[PDB]
């Protein structure tokens, strides 16, 4: 909430204050941190099949 | 009118903008300008009665 009667001020002020939410930032962080292990697991699986 | 949700801001802002209204200022001005002639008329009336 904001103290004003001007329509649209709340939207822009919220956007400026929070360009991106913390939760989604952390979701992206964990996904990026986790993907390399998945890649390594897939590579090891295929290598084991070939061997 | 003012653009805000704060209660009491309109009262103080109006008071600051207009410490005194123009109409009442002009009423005071004309009364002050006119009183001396009334005083002179009364003085002349009493002097004429005495004479
Ligand atoms: C926690 C770990 C120790 C066990 C749980 C994960 C594994 C079971 C993962 C590691 C790599 C995965 C594989 C990596 C890639 C593929 C993608 C996908 O490949 C396809 O068939 C693509 C579809 C197509 O061929 O058109 C099917 C699942 C599979 C075999 C995955 C099956 C599950 C695997 C073996
Ligand atoms: C525009 C001009 C030319 C004419 C119109 C005004 C006059 C009629 C004025 C000028 C001075 C005035 C006088 C000035 C003072 C007094 C106050 C007052 O005096 C009292 O009797 C006070 C009461 C008391 O004695 O206890 C009565 C009206 C009177 C005589 C006024 C009556 C009307 C007068 C004569
Ligand atoms: C103007 C505001 C700029 C904010 C930019 C935020 C970028 C966040 C990127 C998150 C993904 C990595
Ligand atoms: C979004 C991707 C970021 C870069 C990830 C780098 C992963 C490196 C390990 C890949 C191992 C698989 C080799 C075949
Ligand atoms: C503080 C604001 C001060 C404003 C004073 C205005 C005085 C007006 C006087 C009118 C009577 C002569
Ligand atoms: C509020 C009063 C302001 C001063 C007025 C001055 C008037 C002068 C004339 C008086 C004449 C009567 C003499 C008896």
UniProtKB/Swiss-Prot annotation, chains A, B:
Query: Which post-translational modifications are recorded for this protein?
Result: Sumoylated with SUMO1, SUMO2 and SUMO3, which may regulate the level of functional Cx43 gap junctions at the plasma membrane. May be desumoylated by SENP1 or SENP2. Acetylated in the developing cortex; leading to delocalization from the cell membrane.
TM region positions: 25-45
Where does the record place a coiled coil? Answer: none
Mutating residue 24 to H: what's the consequence? In HSS; overlapping features with oculodentodigital dysplasia
Compartments, record wording: Cell membrane; Cell junction, Gap junction; Endoplasmic reticulum
Which residues face the membrane's Extracellular side? 1-24
- Tell me the domain of life: Eukaryota
Tissues where the protein occurs: Expressed at intercalated disks in the heart (at protein level). Expressed in the fetal cochlea.
Q: Which family does it belong to?
A: Belongs to the connexin family. Alpha-type (group II) subfamily.
Instruction: Describe its function.
Output: Gap junction protein that acts as a regulator of bladder capacity. A gap junction consists of a cluster of closely packed pairs of transmembrane channels, the connexons, through which materials of low MW diffuse from one cell to a neighboring cell. May play a critical role in the physiology of hearing by participating in the recycling of potassium to the cochlear endolymph. Negative regulator of bladder functional capacity: acts by enhancing intercellular electrical and chemical transmission, thus sensitizing bladder muscles to cholinergic neural stimuli and causing them to contract.
Q: In its UniProt record, what illness is this protein linked to?
A: Oculodentodigital dysplasia: A disease characterized by a typical facial appearance and variable involvement of the eyes, dentition, and fingers. Characteristic facial features include a narrow, pinched nose with hypoplastic alae nasi, prominent columella and thin anteverted nares together with a narrow nasal bridge, and prominent epicanthic folds giving the impression of hypertelorism. The teeth are usually small and carious. Typical eye findings include microphthalmia and microcornea. Oculodentodigital dysplasia, autosomal recessive: A disease characterized by a typical facial appearance and variable involvement of the eyes, dentition, and fingers. Characteristic facial features include a narrow, pinched nose with hypoplastic alae nasi, prominent columella and thin anteverted nares together with a narrow nasal bridge, and prominent epicanthic folds giving the impression of hypertelorism. The teeth are usually small and carious. Typical eye findings include microphthalmia and microcornea.
- Complexes and interactors: A connexon is composed of a hexamer of connexins. Interacts (via C-terminus) with TJP1. Interacts (via C-terminus) with SRC (via SH3 domain). Interacts (not ubiquitinated) with UBQLN4 (via UBA domain). Interacts with SGSM3 and CNST. Interacts with RIC1/CIP150. Interacts with CSNK1D. Interacts with NOV. Interacts with TMEM65. Interacts with ANK3/ANKG and PKP2.
| Protein's name according to its UniProt entry | Gap junction alpha-1 protein
Organism expressing this protein natively = Homo sapiens (Human)
Q: What is the lineage of its organism?
A: Eukaryota, Metazoa, Chordata, Craniata, Vertebrata
């Amino acid at each position: 909430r904001c103290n004003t009667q001007q329509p649209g001020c709340e939207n822009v002020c919220y956007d400026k204050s929070f360009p991106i939410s913390h939760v989604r930032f952390w979701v992206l962080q964990i996904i990026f941190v986790s993907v390399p292990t998945l890649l390594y697991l897939a590579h090891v699986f295929y290598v084991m099949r070939k061997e």
